[PDB]
Symmetry: D2
């Protein structure tokens, strides 16, 4: 219980959102390894299912506690634990669609469990587009830049994301994030990168829309000396 | 009760939102003239006040039923009444801040009253910026383009907005809106303009954050023959 | 010769540019009415023809001297004559393509003729897109906002443009312009609108790519009192 | 003379451009190591000096031949040699300024020298801004994503850049590039990253504006297995 964290943790999730006027509630459970930056998550749509839009857009909404950090970069995210941190993100798609997501991350040390509460709002996805037609096929791996805001004790993230399409194409989406520990820390990182890789597999049956998500994420500094 | 509307109506409002992590609830009452495109509104912060951000950002969230339309353009908004219409908008500020707002408009014909329920979410306003420092001084009058989407029976709005600043400057914000009647109509307008003019005056006292808002709005076609 | 201008003038044009690596030179002649805001132009491709891209993208590059101004708004553009004015514009298309155009406008009072010299550079139009496939069908009429920059004696223009497509669709393009009289004037306008309407008709034959362009443009203040 | 390249090469440069209406010509000479991804360049302003804008904006305009590539990623850039390749880029600054740059790269095998011819156009830098006030202090190291366009035999680059400011701040700029070998190759890379690090030092004296630029660049695949 280095910051209330252990090598293998469980996670519980609850998301509320509204995309193109369609409301929904999703819940989930997962297992992850904070220090390896690995997590695996099972989501279940609990209101408003089946969703009229691609599962893939919600992927990056479901915890930088799961990142592998080298000893030589401050780990703003694990240091914020157990109380945790919150984040706000805008997604700007190349076709004018816009999302905002908000999440709150917290640890129960007694349960060795992370609680994740999020809100997802999306507007202006064209009904004819790959998201509303569910023609998407996961995000490509990426490199996000993490930038400290020193006067404020918060971080920014900047990653240009690509949602791959079933027809072989790709849809660009700009993520701009604000990461805020619940207690603004005296120790702050220098700017660094975090690389990410997602997998997503639908496991929906007759009763329920359900899928499986994984992330693998590793922080690092510039490769140039 | 042409569409359940009369020449002078009252309006009730309830807004829930969250800007840079700060939650709030606002309620309001107003009086307006649908056919003149004129409205006047009094807002009161009922949770989360005083607000940490400029009142001005919420202005365009508080009803295209209040627009003066010439006989020769279909009035998508009055035609949707009494049931009403919903809209979704993204605000993209020049400094990277992003909002989304959602509203639902409906008429009680028996009460001669419009009900307005909205949600406002904003992220990434810099703490040092004019919005979070409350250094803004109303929006400049504008011309919004309204564009029909014929296969779908909905409209888009496109207006480039300018929030004026107390120091003499201006902050650009791009509004992209989707307007959706609750029943998709057979009669749709051609593209047209709507011009808008807002006024805003804070009337906050010791007990309550409160302000007064007005809009005047007129639709028209191109000025070129 | 109010500013070296008369009610009906001729115009000569020369444009050099490069779009997606393809270089070209266009020359033209026209006739216009400065005080009515009306002009008609004939262009001829003189190097690099036939063009691999839609004629329509060059339309707004070919003179705010041709705008109808009411007496109650300063006419920054006619006041700059005969010496004239220069302008710089960025075009940002919704699909990531980007152009820049630069023009220089000047009067020969002796010839009652406006000289127009411009540069047009475009990058990143997808080869598969409506511009490079020549699938476009004129711009929709628009309303540009003109904004004074008082410390500097220059104007900005902001117009959200829509290039119509032969298949019934539309392509958004954001124009941001800087208008600079060659002598920064003591008399500056307040912000106002200019509305525009273009027509374009190809008149290409066997020897030469050629087309005809017209503009009609009228300035005005807000329609709200 | 693997593709006409050797381990250490000289480079000659000529740039023509225009930023906010100010024209200029720059020439340069350098020495670099193609296989190490290292180059060092000396620039001299030969017309239009001293420049009214920060040297730093021209930095990324002055050759992906200088990138360290692992054996397991196709090197589109060295493979295009000696004939070479061309590229087109848009720069979109957070404050609305816009640039376009075009370059042509070619090898003289007999002289063991790379020739670099470029064009740089910038508009809408505010006179009051850090670029026009020369208040900038180099770009931060970055990670660019290189994306193949398989039907066309060209690459795209996407990098979100940060120009550091003398006052401790930062200015965001989005680079979107198109890389085109003069002969479209049968061998194309998969998407990968290139990381970059620039240094810039002014060496201007009484006669001439002059500076020294270096780049170090290394390609790599995702760090996630």
């Amino acid at each position: 219980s280095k910051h209330g964290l252990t090598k293998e943790m469980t996670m519980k999730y609850r998301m509320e959102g509204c995309v193109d006027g369609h409301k929904f509630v999703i819940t989930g459970e997962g297992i992850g390894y904070p220090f390896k930056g690995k997590q695996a998550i099972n989501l279940c749509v609990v209101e408003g299912g089946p969703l009229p839009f691609a599962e893939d857009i919600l992927s990056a909404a479901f915890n930088r506690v799961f990142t592998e950090y080298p000893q030589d970069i401050v780990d703003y995210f694990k240091n914020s634990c157990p109380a945790g941190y919150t984040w706000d993100r805008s997604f700007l798609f190349e076709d004018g669609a816009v999302c905002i997501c908000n999440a709150d991350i917290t640890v129960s040390v007694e349960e060795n469990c992370m609680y994740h509460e999020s809100k997802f709002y999306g507007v202006n996805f064209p009904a004819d587009g790959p998201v509303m037609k569910k023609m998407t096929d996961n995000w490509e791996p990426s490199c996000e830049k993490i930038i400290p805001v020193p006067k404020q004790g918060i971080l920014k993230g900047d990653v240009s994301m690509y949602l791959l399409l079933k027809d072989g194409g790709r849809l660009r989406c700009q993520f701009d994030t604000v990461y805020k520990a619940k207690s603004v820390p005296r120790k702050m990182p220098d700017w660094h990168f975090i690389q990410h890789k997602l997998t997503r597999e639908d496991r929906s049956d007759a009763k329920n829309q359900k899928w499986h998500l994984t992330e693998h994420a590793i922080a690092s500094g510039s490769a140039l000396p």
